[PDB]
Symmetry: D2
Subunit: 293 residues, 4 copies
Amino acid sequence: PEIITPIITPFTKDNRIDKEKLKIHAENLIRKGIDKLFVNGTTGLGPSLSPEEKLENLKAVYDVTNKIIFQVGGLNLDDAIRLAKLSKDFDIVGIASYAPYYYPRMSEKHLVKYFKTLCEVSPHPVYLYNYPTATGKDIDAKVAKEIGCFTGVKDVIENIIHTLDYKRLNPNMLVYSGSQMLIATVASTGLDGNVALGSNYLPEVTVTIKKLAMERKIDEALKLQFLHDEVIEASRIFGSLSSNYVLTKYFQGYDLGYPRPPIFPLDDEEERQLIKKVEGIRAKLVELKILKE
Amino acid sequence: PEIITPIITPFTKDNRIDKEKLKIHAENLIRKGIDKLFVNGTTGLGPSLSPEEKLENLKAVYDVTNKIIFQVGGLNLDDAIRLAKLSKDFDIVGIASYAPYYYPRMSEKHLVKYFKTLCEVSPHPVYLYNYPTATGKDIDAKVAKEIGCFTGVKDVIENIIHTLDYKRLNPNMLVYSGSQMLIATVASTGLDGNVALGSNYLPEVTVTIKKLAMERKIDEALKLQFLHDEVIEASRIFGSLSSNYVLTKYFQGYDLGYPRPPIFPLDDEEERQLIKKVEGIRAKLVELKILKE
Amino acid sequence: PEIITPIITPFTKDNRIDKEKLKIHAENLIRKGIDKLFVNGTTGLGPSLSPEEKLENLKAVYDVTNKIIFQVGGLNLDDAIRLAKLSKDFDIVGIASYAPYYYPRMSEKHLVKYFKTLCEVSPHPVYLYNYPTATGKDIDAKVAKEIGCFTGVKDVIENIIHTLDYKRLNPNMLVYSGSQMLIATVASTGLDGNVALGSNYLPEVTVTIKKLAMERKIDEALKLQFLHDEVIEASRIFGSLSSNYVLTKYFQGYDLGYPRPPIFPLDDEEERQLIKKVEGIRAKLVELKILKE
Amino acid sequence: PEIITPIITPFTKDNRIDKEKLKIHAENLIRKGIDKLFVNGTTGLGPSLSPEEKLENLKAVYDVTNKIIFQVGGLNLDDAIRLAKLSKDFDIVGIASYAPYYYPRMSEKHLVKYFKTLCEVSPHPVYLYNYPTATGKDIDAKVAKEIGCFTGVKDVIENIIHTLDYKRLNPNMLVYSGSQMLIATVASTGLDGNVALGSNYLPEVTVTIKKLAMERKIDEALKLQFLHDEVIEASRIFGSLSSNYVLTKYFQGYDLGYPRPPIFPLDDEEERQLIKKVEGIRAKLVELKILKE
């Protein structure tokens, strides 16, 4: 079982990638036990990044670790192809792409052709990044099998039979769940792990839940699962993608800069209110020894 | 943890409840180790039954077992109240209701009032039957807490965190998943069991999966899960509610009559083609000694 | 072109149909220029009614007028058949049915078979009552052509091209939009009229909008359309099916009793708040000489 | 009332904007009676275009006409700001943005701030481009009023009351419908016109339907509307965004090149199949003297 972090992209106030803050974040994540870093995903604002910014994120994180899955997708296939080819110089786990977003009513033929083109040029294993609520399209287990060239899939959806279908129809595929419910997906249900949004700011929890689950300490893991869930709930008050910056700095102790508008940073009063909502949770996790004070 | 069967309602050719076939079905499921029978649920065509017929279903199954949850809901609250009160003289597990179906844009106030009304008159513990896809409404963990009188919930939805939420916010509530993925909901994930529609025609498979999972035999349980999912898949070819009758006759060896139109029965040709699709699953299940030839 | 009123069903405090209030209501609507009365529709709480209650509505309104479309649908096809046959003794415009509701993933074949079965037994022209938000299913122009036997369709959907499609694919079909926008649907855009929710409580407004629209007095018609839309939005604050009762009493001056729970009646405070939100609209309609002081 | 064409972006075989083909297309659209050209819209593959390409599109079309609405939106608000400011030296109708796409559960506050930031920097009127099925978010009349700085709205949605709401709550706002039903939106129902995808390839049909509708020749208008609808239906066979290129070349007589993958071009077989679908429509339009042979 593996935990994969869809890593946040920190931006400066000039709205450029803060390479040094991203280096520090990646270091802390690997040191806290995260298995792999997924770069240019939804949580890292991948669609908000130009192709060159996506590449910059790869380089920054690669200085720290090879354990990278490099998201390269977009609405210009030639750009996605170019990023796939540029990745040949990086000894990483894989590249990935979401399905073409925005456009409604795209044919399965065209969607399949998009992914097969990336497979044909990829110097690395190719991962499906399946996120129907964001992209408007579902590349399900059957379509993945038609595509035939994925080494793995990240199924960002709460429909757990949907995720298990990839394993059933593609037995050699690595299958990761993007469900908020780590306890039921990380271990012991036929999947290879979880892509965990909350691991950016509380990697100790996600990793500890993983261990507890494999040791059969379900009651103990559920308690942390619930704390994790209460943080997620709180992150939605002002917007999860923006709140992830405030929460990471609060729980981990280092700044991550700003998101990219229109993912607007929380202002000082919203940050204050959000910290107030999660301060009791942090005290509990300290009392439990998952976080050092 | 438990397996609850949303039990099929057998109808005769002239569209009457076939009480003797219902009793045979109920006995078989109890004999094979189903824990409770959920009567007048979706799989039993509850919404197609008059309140008179819902009570007759209760009376038929009660001649077999008192391990009954009695679904009484509908769009005439007085009829639901009457069914609840009439259940007084049955030593059963509880009553249940789905949310008011059909009408869109019902206020939360009215939804809460409907359910509190049933609690006030019920002589038994009351179960929430949550099925957003069929009813158009979600009675989520927060709304259930506001209602405040549910002994348990059956959450018929693939969203596994949605189901867990009930336990986090209502720690004394019994929480059952209606997910197709037995292996992640029947044990060791914080839940009390699974309401399994496939358990009508393959109770042995669902009961055995519950055991293998408790015993941590995930590989062996996974193999049965996939076979169960293949049958499920096959049932969608002509319609699951209709097909569940053909499948139960095929896998369990007794006739369950007809569904109620507009849930039309499969014709002779459709039956033959469906059997064709699952005869190899049957054969595999025999070799595994899950079923007898 | 025609205005069709989906007529309210008044109930007594004992939750039985109030025949005398229904007769009074139907009389007023005909007197005010409504062309036809659609009985046991959504606004009449058709799905909350037993087969015998649906028949009682037909009978009460038929004492007043034969300009009736009689909705008979349900999840027990024998009951629908029985109602269709019982309508023979009533010289009305036609019978109608919505698609089978609640049950998801019903096959097109079964949906077609339901409607063709009703056509086979109907002594009258058969109308499609298409309401996909309420039923979960869409019987679109193509499926309607396949069914082959509809004299007309009431398409309750805001998607105006979807409604015109019925005319394009079935040139002999009478086609009525259920859209809130009377101006663009009631006349001069290809359709035969509008099934108008608001017509229960402001029949004068919908008739006058039709006349002005036919006269091409668009500015005048829009002013009324906007006052009508404001009443619609007020009706949704507490639930439009419940507010329809208060609004009919307020604007038409007679009582329509109660809805049937779980369509709960507005409580005293809600009634007061709803009146406050429309009492200026009333004043303006009086000033404009659409309503009587 | 006005017709606005969301103009196609022609690309070369090597995926570069083909400026000369764009100019030829814009010239023909203006010549055939189209009032305004909307550049970098959905039909023009705006989200597939870099900010540099969005500007190049403006520059090409501006050599032909200054009746341009310049779509500038994106997920890097600095790029949108830059494009807005660069537009100062062009005497155009306005700029436009869709809502921030892809990311789900964006707060209203952040959506409002996005649009207000554009208004604060815009040297021109600002248009709301409302396209909820593509963007995942609806900026409805009420939020539009709260944003408070739009000169006009393009409501790409078939819900016609939704579109009218903008005019009701914002009387000075220009309100265009993107619905497929020209005859009910272009004239005489309260709106200022229609943004018509089909106007790229059959501008003659779009302009004549408007003329007929204004003249109140509804039967003649409706007959063209149906022909238009049959082409749109044929364009869905292989994908509308791709089929618009083939249809423009077929009906208008000049090459528009290729779309940008993953909006893949129709291959030679698909083009022939689609032409066979519409050649009867073309001959009919020649017979009606809408098109010259």
